[PDB]
Design a protein around this nucleic acid. Structure first.
Ligand SMILES: [Mg+2]
Ligand SMILES: [Mg+2]
Ligand SMILES: [Mg+2]
Ligand SMILES: [Mg+2]
Ligand SMILES: [Mg+2]
Ligand SMILES: [Mg+2]
Ligand SMILES: [Mg+2]
Ligand SMILES: [Mg+2]
Ligand SMILES: [Mg+2]
Ligand SMILES: [Mg+2]
Ligand SMILES: [Mg+2]
Ligand SMILES: [Mg+2]
Ligand SMILES: [Mg+2]
Ligand SMILES: [Mg+2]
Ligand SMILES: [Mg+2]
Ligand SMILES: [Mg+2]
Ligand SMILES: [Mg+2]
Ligand SMILES: [Mg+2]
Ligand SMILES: [Mg+2]
Ligand SMILES: [Mg+2]
Ligand SMILES: [Mg+2]
Ligand SMILES: [Mg+2]
Ligand SMILES: [Mg+2]
Ligand SMILES: [Mg+2]
Ligand SMILES: [Mg+2]
Ligand SMILES: [Mg+2]
Ligand SMILES: [Mg+2]
Ligand SMILES: [Mg+2]
Ligand SMILES: [Mg+2]
Ligand SMILES: [Mg+2]
Ligand SMILES: [Mg+2]
Ligand SMILES: [Mg+2]
Ligand SMILES: [Mg+2]
Ligand SMILES: [Mg+2]
Lengths: 328, 208, 177, 343, 132
RNA sequence: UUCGCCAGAGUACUACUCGCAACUGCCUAAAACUCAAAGGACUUGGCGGUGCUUCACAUCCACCUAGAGGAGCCUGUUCUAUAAUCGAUAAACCCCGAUAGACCUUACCAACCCUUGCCAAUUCAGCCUAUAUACCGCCAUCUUCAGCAAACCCUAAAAAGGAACAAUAGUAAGCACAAUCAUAGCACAUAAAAACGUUAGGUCAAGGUGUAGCUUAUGGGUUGGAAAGAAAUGGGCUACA
RNA sequence: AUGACCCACCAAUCACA
């Protein structure tokens, strides 16, 4: 299947030249991005599965990694671990154990000479370091693996990293390091806005349950709230809804210090109360300190409420409720 | 369950967040709370940061509700609290200085005391042995006893009133009668305790 | 093991003493065979399932330019070669057993299956091992480190010497014409 | 009514009823049979019974260097064409109703004795055309399954040999009969015995073996006496290359046990050379037809003994009451002397 | 079980097209539509007509090209003209192929009163997506 | 080396004999007749009011909420009833084929009519005639169950079985599950999906068909009729405030 | 507590002259 890959790369280069020509672009500055835009335009397949869409890519990405030829033309296998049926994995383990033996020898010689010169590199935790998944290891060796195989290997790496770390040994166990991406849930503060000689006005947008709310709050005004051009006491006759509007302000002790205007559409009265509650909470985050933002998040003020009406299902009554079931 | 198991419940208390600096283990605890990058459920519409809301009053409100009416049930709760208040003011101004020192005008403490008085100590579970069902005395969990108290209250003041009589009236009546231990609700709790003593031997059938 | 008695010099206070005269007589022939196999350019597999000397053996075979299976032996490995290993394969022309048992103390499958496959087998058969299906058994101790190391070394050297003599007689063959 | 019609595949799938529930549990008989015939088999593009000739289809596009016009055949011409197509149908019906001959192994409906033809070439390119395979026993066997209930697998026992002294048997099992045949062949090649043949016709010496509950007793015959044996044993013998033998089987006649026991007993043979070597003496054969003349068969390579064998006046040997009864003419069985066809 | 437009799993030998290898719940997800026309859009008319036309076209094309039809028809309708795209086995000599191209295009142009285009893509044998 | 026993199963630890402190006894022990098997061990299932663990998440008990069963109506079955359709009819039928019957639809009944009688041609059209136990097509059901299966390999024989991770014979492509896709951002949820088989499950009345039936009729038209509530019951709607 | 009887595996193709 090698001649296949050679050919596929030839015809990929030729075809990339052709595509660069018809699209009217420089064949040299053509990227995979541009190829993607090009075929997206030329063959526009709406299909919801993205792997079923038209693709021209480099044959190495398209085709799966191949296990190379395991023996010479005389029949003698290249690797000495061949007959294990896993040569890659058991090679990996052989070398890992070889280096653990090396660390033990070297560190024992340094125990006899009265020297512990090493340090523990085992905590990478601020880097967000983790081990490979079984999938990654499987891809690295170009060989299928078992859960107990991966677990064995990882445990042996834990044995290695728990000892004094050499340079070559550190570099070795760091192939098998991955770094988990950024973990911070800190919000993104709306930059405060100054408009037409008026000072300190912030905006926020809540969405709850068919109801959308856009809230503009002024920190320069006294306490009142105008929802869709009318007073909040008029728009929300129910006490519960006014308490919902009162929640974030009472939470921040801002109850008299801010003046708000709102546009809320759709849903019912309580859905609107909630949307405005959320919008208001997200709007008051520009005026407050970075700690009280975390306090509002931990009171559940800043999170949208995912709870939404479920679709009725055929053969049932209420999307949960079922028709009366007769035994006999 | 539109929330994954990852989502923690919100802590609505303002006093907790306002005065952190005096406690080490709790500082460490809510440090681990937010710094864990922990998702938080959106705070409920029923629950507020309000200094005026009693969770027990809210539970009883819910337990009164028929259909989807929070409005009508909150209405009847409000009216019952107001009715207890004014009943105790009417009892206050017709009394003398001693009984003006004694009588309680807080409808909240009357609610909580009536329910504490009306909650059962012990209970009955049916158990199948030898092809017969025996009623057996079972110690109850707290929440179960609170529930039983409230449900017994609403059961009686729904069922036993005359149709002319309004709900806040009957409910305030029974709240003030159960405050003083003389209500039919406490008679029900007593029927339970007497049926729990009549069967006391059968307490051996309980295996837990 | 009952079949081990002709190889025993005797029992000293409950411990079994292997006769080393016979051990030498056998090991001679075993090494002889092993070298002759390496000379004729054929595959030698070191099989042991013992986890002490696993690394040592893998090391030994890597250093002779020979192959080692020290791991869990997959079921159809020798019998069904083409599926486990690949489309067509060569199989080891000799198999060396440093331990004739598996860690549950039964005979290593590869003995029965190398027999099954018409492959000759050299192995170190301890006092409790079964010699029957092994082609060139060498009676001796497989448990203690100096014994295992001695045999590792011995087979290493026999292999290396064989391959070298092959190289040199080849050079002589090329200078002949 | 045009939209109310369908594909031929759909129609055949419908009419044949192969996928039904009657086929699976064997809820219907095997003597009931109907087949699918292609209706496009003998038809050409453009042909119709109206008789038209189209320039691109029925007839060549250009006749005499010009373009042929759309035309129609004469009435009688179309009569002859339809006669031809009818005779084509009758020809294929004549071909279809003729059943190919199946060579019978032992009985008409038995698979035993039947040849499967040379086994399949190994993965290395190794090919045996010198090997023939015979079926010993085919048997329908069942297992109770959680879902399916009774589940029927065929298992066949098959033997192979080159006639040159190498032979072996194996068993194979599958849901389909064909599959099991294949499996059993290819597996049989792997287990082969070498059976030593004295003078390449008989065995070396009299054998008697009890394998499990089966008793095989084989006596070594002279040159002219062909293969007097249980039919299975005759088969295996023709595969080994043993041309002259007598074998009686007693006890359980169960096939597998019979061939395992047989191959064991033939494998346990002791060659005159092995005997010569273990006794260190000359083994010397006395033909009755050649008289007192002492033909020396085997000589003990290595050092011959100067010590004569101890002479036992009366030997101690286990004797079969059957052989003794035979020797003294007390076997009167009407079944024993019967004339049979050739080996 | 759902039997709709499904090719059941055989003993594992059964050759299958990309088309037949995907059940009805995979339309618009993996496999696309075998017909393209406006009539099924929100504000549009004469879906019924386009449908009956479609059916007759499949039946007709199947009968006119016996045995050489590889995959199900692709019917594209653009501004009164229909382009029929077909995958065809190599069976007939190109003479017959062109004969039937012209004959069909003409015949259906005169039957449906609109211009009919016919595009034949020839393939050596049925393209196999699965099993086999 | 001996002795005692044993010649298909039942009939039969029986009938008749001899002997016996036994008299409803023991001992000895047949045949007619009946059958084509009777037996012994095993294998894989299934099952068990068998035991031990672990569970159930609308789910069994404990427990929560709202209903049904009683009333009136609405609608469907069952019966009874008519000259007067059919189909479903434990779970997996019962506002079910029907997202739909005043005529039509319509297949039924009663009268009447028409016999190359829809088509380019056809000693042919046409059939809602029988068979869903001949079927294709669609499905139900186990089932949000985790298995099915080709090709090999192993077993002092193999009916079948085939794991032990400090690993003892199993490799396996494929299909399901899983993953992706949808519900316009994630996540969750929901939808969709769910193999092989099981219930000769449902449907010849969607249509198509095998086999067997009708042909001035079991086919094609027109007109008008299809009632009804003794009773029983399912599912609903409206209530009893 | 109960639940007529009867149910199952013994036949081989296609294509060409
Ligand atoms: Mg509902
Ligand atoms: Mg040992
Ligand atoms: Mg015959
Ligand atoms: Mg008898
Ligand atoms: Mg007795
Ligand atoms: Mg008697
Ligand atoms: Mg007698
Ligand atoms: Mg329930
Ligand atoms: Mg109701
Ligand atoms: Mg009711
Ligand atoms: Mg009712
Ligand atoms: Mg009906
Ligand atoms: Mg019918
Ligand atoms: Mg019926
Ligand atoms: Mg049913
Ligand atoms: Mg009518
Ligand atoms: Mg009719
Ligand atoms: Mg059916
Ligand atoms: Mg699986
Ligand atoms: Mg066995
Ligand atoms: Mg198996
Ligand atoms: Mg597989
Ligand atoms: Mg998605
Ligand atoms: Mg999900
Ligand atoms: Mg679903
Ligand atoms: Mg899925
Ligand atoms: Mg049925
Ligand atoms: Mg029926
Ligand atoms: Mg019909
Ligand atoms: Mg009418
Ligand atoms: Mg009713
Ligand atoms: Mg219903
Ligand atoms: Mg009875
Ligand atoms: Mg029964």
């Amino acid at each position: 299947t090698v001649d296949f890959i050679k050919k596929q790369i030839e015809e990929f280069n030729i075809g990339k030249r052709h595509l660069a020509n018809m699209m009217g672009e420089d064949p040299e500055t053509f990227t995979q991005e541009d190829i993607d835009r090009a075929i997206a335009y030329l063959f526009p397949s709406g299909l919801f599965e993205k792997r079923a869409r038209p693709i021209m890519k480099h044959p190495e990405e398209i085709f799966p990694k191949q296990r190379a030829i395991q023996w010479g033309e005389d029949g003698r296998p290249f690797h000495f671990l061949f007959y294990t049926g896993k040569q890659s994995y058991y090679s990996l383990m052989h070398d890992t154990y070889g280096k653990l033996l090396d660390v033990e020898k070297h560190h024992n010689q340094l125990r006899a000479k009265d020297l512990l010169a090493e340090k523990t590199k085992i905590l990478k935790d601020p880097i967000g370091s983790r081990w490979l998944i079984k999938e990654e290891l499987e891809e690295m060796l170009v060989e299928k693996l078992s859960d107990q195989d991966y677990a064995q290997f990882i445990r042996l790496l834990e044995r290695l990293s728990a000892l004094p770390c050499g340079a070559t040994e550190e570099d070795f166990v760091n192939r098998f390091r991955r770094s988990i991406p950024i973990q911070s849930k800190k919000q993104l503060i709306e930059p405060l806005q100054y408009d037409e000689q008026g000072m300190a006005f912030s905006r926020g947008e809540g969405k709850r349950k068919t109801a959308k709310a856009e809230v503009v709050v002024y920190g320069q005004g006294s306490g009142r709230i105008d929802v869709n051009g009318v007073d909040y006491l008029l728009y929300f006759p129910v006490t519960q809804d006014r308490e919902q509007l009162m929640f974030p302000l009472h939470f921040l002790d801002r109850l008299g210090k801010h003046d708000m205007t709102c546009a809320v559409s759709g849903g019912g009265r309580s859905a609107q109360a909630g949307a405005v509650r959320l919008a208001m909470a997200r709007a008051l985050c520009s005026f407050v300190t970075e700690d009280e933002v975390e306090w509002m998040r931990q009171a559940g003020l800043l999170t949208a409420d995912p709870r939404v009406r479920e679709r009725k299902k055929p053969g049932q009554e209420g999307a949960r409720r079922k028709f009366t079931w007769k035994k006999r | 369950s539109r929330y994954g198991p990852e989502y923690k419940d919100p802590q609505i208390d303002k006093e907790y967040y306002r005065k952190p600096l005096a406690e080490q283990t709790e500082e460490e605890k809510y440090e681990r709370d937010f710094k864990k990058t922990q998702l938080i459920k959106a705070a409920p519409a029923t629950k507020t940061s309000s200094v005026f809301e009693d969770p027990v009053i809210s539970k009883f409100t819910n337990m009164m509700m028929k259909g989807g009416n929070k409005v009508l049930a909150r209405s009847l709760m409000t009216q019952t609290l107001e009715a207890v208040k004014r009943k105790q003011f009417a009892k206050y101004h017709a009394a003398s200085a001693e009984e003006q020192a004694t009588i309680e005008r807080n409808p909240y403490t009357i609610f909580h005391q009536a329910l504490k008085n009306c909650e059962p100590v012990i209970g009955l579970v049916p158990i199948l042995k030898g092809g017969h069902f025996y009623q057996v005395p079972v110690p109850l969990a707290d929440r179960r006893r609170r529930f039983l108290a409230m449900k017994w209250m609403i059961a009686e003041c729904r069922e036993k009133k005359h149709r002319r009589v309004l709900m806040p009236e009957k409910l305030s009546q029974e709240l003030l009668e159960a405050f003083h231990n003389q209500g039919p609700v406490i008679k029900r709790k007593h029927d339970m305790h007497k049926m729990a003593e009549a069967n006391r031997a059968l307490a051996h059938y309980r295996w837990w | 093991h009952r079949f081990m008695e002709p190889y025993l010099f005797g029992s000293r206070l409950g411990q079994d003493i292997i006769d080393l005269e016979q051990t030498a007589a056998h090991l001679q022939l075993a090494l002889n065979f092993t070298a002759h196999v390496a000379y004729r350019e054929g595959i030698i597999l070191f099989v042991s399932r013992h986890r002490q000397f696993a690394h040592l053996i893998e090391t030994t075979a890597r250093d002779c330019g020979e192959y080692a299976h020290t791991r869990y032996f997959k079921g159809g490995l020798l019998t069904n070669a083409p599926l486990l290993l690949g489309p067509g394969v060569r199989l080891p022309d000799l198999i060396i057993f440093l331990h004739t048992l598996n860690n549950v103390f039964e005979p290593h499958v590869a003995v029965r299956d190398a027999a099954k496959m018409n492959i000759p087998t050299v192995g170190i058969v301890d006092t409790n091992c079964n010699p029957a299906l092994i082609t060139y058994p060498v009676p001796g101790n497989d448990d203690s480190p100096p014994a295992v190391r001695l045999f590792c070394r011995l087979f290493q050297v026999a292999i290396s010497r064989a391959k070298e003599k092959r190289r040199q007689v080849e050079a002589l063959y090329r200078l002949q014409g | 009514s045009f939209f109310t019609k369908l594909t031929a595949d759909e129609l055949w799938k419908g009419a044949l009823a192969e996928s039904g529930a009657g086929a699976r549990k064997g809820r219907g008989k095997r003597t009931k049979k109907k087949r699918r015939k292609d209706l496009n088999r003998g038809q050409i593009i453009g042909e119709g019974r109206h008789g038209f000739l189209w320039p691109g289809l029925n007839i060549p596009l250009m006749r005499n260097g010009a373009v042929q016009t759309i035309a129609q055949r004469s009435k009688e011409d179309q009569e002859k064409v339809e006669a031809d197509m009818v005779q084509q149908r009758e020809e294929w019906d004549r071909r279809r109703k003729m059943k190919v001959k199946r060579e019978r192994g032992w009985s008409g409906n038995t698979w035993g004795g039947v040849s499967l033809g040379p086994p399949d070439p190994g993965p290395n390119g190794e090919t045996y055309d010198d090997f023939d395979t015979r079926i010993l026993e085919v048997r329908n066997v069942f297992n109770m399954t959680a879902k399916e209930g009774r589940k029927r697998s065929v298992r066949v026992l098959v033997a192979v040999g080159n006639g040159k002294g190498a032979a072996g048997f194996a068993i194979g099992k599958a849901t389909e009969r064909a599959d099991a045949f294949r499996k059993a062949k290819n597996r049989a090649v792997h287990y082969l015995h070498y059976i030593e043949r004295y003078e390449d016709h008989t065995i070396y010496h009299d054998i008697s073996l009890k394998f499990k509950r089966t008793h095989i007793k084989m006596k070594k015959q002279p040159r002219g006496y062909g293969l007097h044996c249980h039919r299975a044993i005759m088969t295996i013998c023709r595969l080994i290359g043993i041309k002259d033998l007598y074998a009686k089987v007693s006890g359980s006649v169960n096939m597998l046990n019979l061939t395992r026991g047989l191959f064991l007993g033939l494998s346990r043979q002791e060659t005159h050379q092995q005997l010569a070597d273990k006794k260190s003496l000359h083994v010397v054969e006395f033909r009755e037809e050649c008289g007192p003349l002492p033909i020396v068969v085997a000589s003990p390579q290595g050092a011959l003994r100067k010590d004569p064998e101890p002479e036992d006046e009366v030997p101690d040997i286990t004797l079969d009451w059957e052989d003794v009864k035979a020797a003294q003419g007390m076997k009167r069985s009407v079944w024993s002397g019967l004339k049979r066809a050739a080996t | 079980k759902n039997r709709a437009a499904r090719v059941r799993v055989s003993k594992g030998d059964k050759p299958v097209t990309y088309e037949e290898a995907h059940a009805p719940h995979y339309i618009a997800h993996r496999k696309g539509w075998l017909s393209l026309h406006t009539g099924n859009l929100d504000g549009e008319d004469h879906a019924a007509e386009r449908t009956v036309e479609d059916v007759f076209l499949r039946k007709f094309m199947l009968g006119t090209f016996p045995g050489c039809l590889a995959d199900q028809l692709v019917l594209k309708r653009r501004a009164n003209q229909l382009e029929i795209c077909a995958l065809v086995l190599r069976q007939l000599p190109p003479h017959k192929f062109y004969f039937l191209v012209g004959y069909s295009e003409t015949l259906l142009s005169h039957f449906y009163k609109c211009p009919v285009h016919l595009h034949l893509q020839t393939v050596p044998s049925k393209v196999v997506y699965k099993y086999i």
